[model samples]
Target: ATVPHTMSTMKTADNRPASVYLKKDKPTLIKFWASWCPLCLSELGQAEKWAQDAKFSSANLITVASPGFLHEKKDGEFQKWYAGLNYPKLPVVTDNGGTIAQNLNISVYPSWALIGKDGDVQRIVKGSINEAQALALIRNPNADLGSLKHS
Candidate 1:
């Protein structure tokens, strides 16, 4: 319902292709974040390692670069930081003008979205979450995101 069937423009953070679209074949876990959030930064760091794990292969694991509602971004802040971190296995994308997050109704700095294989938004959890919590959602579309208020 809330999920859009259209594809959004995304710039690849690494060698992965920049083109991304919500698919009907599998679930998608998208992490919408900005360079200014500390928790956002931490989550991306952890994602680098967890994303490459075999369990994560069942669904698409993507990280979206956003300019948080509360903060403004410099011209090349996200690109510069990601260029340096260089998580080769992760699928990182630039959500230009925060359009993706806005469309997803995400206003929090470190938010995660679990899109079901049926193209429905299963859940939108705001704040910091661990790899296990993230993986749980990906593994089972019905799983609860648990409390994410600990950010």
Candidate 2:
């Protein structure tokens, strides 16, 4: 399966209108998360580390913030809140009303969807994933879908 070509409801962490699309030029890894989930924070921290790692610099890493318990905020509010918190410097697309998650069929927070260069969703893994597994998936779409691990 493939991801949506574009989502109109998406917004950047700064609360600016934004859209997220898969690039055929390089593989894209989309991390689906919610602010209310503590585990999501852990994974986002790890993702931040991975974003800086030179080995994975060629790959595209993006985080998607979907709806959750008390997670929805008014326009400009999310950006204000995000500014005070620490998270990956990577580009973030707020999935308004969880549209992106619904399109991607993501049922859990902290899920990962590895997309190939062709824009096809290669794998969608729920729960936790380590750097090794993440890097492997980015490097090889056919890489083994390892068991989910909690940080």
Candidate 3:
């Protein structure tokens, strides 16, 4: 697979540049989603509500879709979803080639990986979570969020 400059060349549905916000003073909450997957969309909706106003001020919260879905009409779909949810400042991006998800061996649709401030895999959440649990994970990325995880 081709290695992009960033962990994932995450260009958002809004057509932003390849976001490089990792390895900073905070952990980047990269949540992988898909338009075809109902679970993923549900999580995205929950996340959008949680990210209403200056949410997760300490961490970098990002929404990522697999590049496989990056087609001509897909951008409109994202905007339609955003039209209702409306997270204006959220850094939504698509994995350039699904490299990051493939490398991490994510076997699920709505998985969330917490990259620590030191630029390492602090935790891997392999299933869906509610807004409150998601907030806890964002606030304490490096902490042991055992209860919020899956089997």
Per-residue alpha-carbon lDDT of model 3 for 8-52, expressed as tens digits?
455666666645644367767778776667777666656665555
Better of 2 and 3 by lDDT: 2
Q: Candidate 2 residues 8-121, lDDT tens each? A: 345678665544433348888888877668888666667877777887776778787754323556445656767778763666777657776777778777888887766677
Model 1, span 1-151: residue lDDT tens: 2443433444555534444535457788888777777777766768877767887778877777753344636436656766887577677776556766777788886888888877678888887677778777888766765554253
Give the residue spans of candidate 3 off by over 4 A. Answer: 1-5, 20-23, 69-87, 142-151
lDDT of 2: 0.70
Query: What's model 2's lDDT at 45?
Result: 68
Model number with the top lDDT:
2
TM-score of structure candidate 3: 0.72
By summed lDDT, the worst window of 10 consecutive residues in model 3 runs over 67-76
lDDT of each: 0.69, 0.70, 0.64
Candidate with the greatest TM-score versus the true structure: 2
Alpha-carbon lDDT of model 3? 0.64
Model 2 — TM-score against the truth? Answer: 0.80
